[PDB]
Ligand binder design. Structure first.
Ligand SMILES: Cn1c(=O)n(C2CCN(CCCn3nc(-c4ccc(C(F)(F)F)cc4)c4c3CCN(C(=O)c3cnc[nH]3)C4)CC2)c2ccccc21
Length: 219
């Protein structure tokens, strides 16, 4: 297994997004993970629609749009819906709306998804190295998280009760500190150009490896 990866370097990560007041971090984590698989499969990097997930992957998938939801069930919707629209065709509005999915603008598809075992940072590392970026949840309910600007994030009072969806797009070590490279959905002004490096191999720090999952686009 490699010592560092960074999927941005293989043009598999889209630009950082800005969720704003709507609690759709889950949807941004989901589309992030699938964007990468679409690139690998097709060579084309296209931002997929979070608003589509918010509007259409709803109570039938255990989701509540701007009030929260899960990546796993988002991935199921895309399997069930037999498609997801492009961001360009179904733009993010940071509010709940009627479902406006149109298969004419389908930009990707999803065949299956996998969940990783809880708390297994060795397994998460393997998946990130061998499969692509991985959707995870983190415990982001801490002032130090919102105020993070750079370096390797470590919060002594972090828990493994995750509440905020993000994308693991790499890992590495910086000056002795092992980290995971995490794309967030708070725009470019957050952290390191929209990214946060987070403590790795520090006992499932902030629950980063509590609920990982990733999609696959077959055939
Ligand atoms: C109607 N209907 C549902 O309801 N389902 C459920 C939706 C998700 N469930 C829970 C998954 C586990 N699970 N997933 C998160 C989770 C994942 C990601 C995020 C975020 F998006 F923010 F990233 C937030 C929470 C948390 C947990 C358990 C407790 N949690 C912890 O963090 C924790 C565990 N040990 C210490 N702490 C939160 C299982 C089924 C349905 C599934 C199919 C069809 C219809 C369905």
């Amino acid at each position: 297994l490699p010592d560092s990866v960074d999927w941005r370097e293989k043009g598999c990560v889209t630009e950082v997004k800005y969720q704003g007041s709507c609690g759709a971090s889950w949807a941004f984590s989901a589309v992030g993970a699938l964007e990468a698989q679409l690139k690998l499969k097709t060579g084309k990097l296209v931002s997929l629609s979070a608003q589509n997930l918010v509007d259409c992957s709803t109570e039938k998938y255990g989701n509540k749009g701007c009030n929260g939801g899960f990546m796993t069930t988002a991935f199921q919707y895309i399997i069930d819906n037999k498609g997801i629209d492009s961001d360009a065709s179904y733009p993010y509005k940071a509010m709940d709306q009627k479902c406006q999915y149109d298969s004419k603008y389908r930009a990707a598809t999803c065949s299956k998804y996998t969940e990783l075992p809880y708390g297994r940072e060795d397994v998460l590392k393997e998946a990130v190295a061998n499969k692509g970026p991985v959707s995870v949840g983190v415990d982001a309910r801490h002032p130090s998280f919102f105020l993070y600007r750079s370096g390797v994030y470590y919060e002594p009072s972090c828990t493994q009760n995750v509440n905020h969806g993000v994308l693991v797009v790499g890992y590495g070590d910086l000056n002795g500190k092992e980290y995971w490279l995490v794309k967030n959905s708070w725009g470019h002004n957050f952290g390191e150009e929209g990214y946060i490096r987070m403590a790795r191999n520090k006992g499932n720090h902030c629950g980063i490896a509590s609920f990982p999952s990733y999609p696959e686009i077959l055939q």
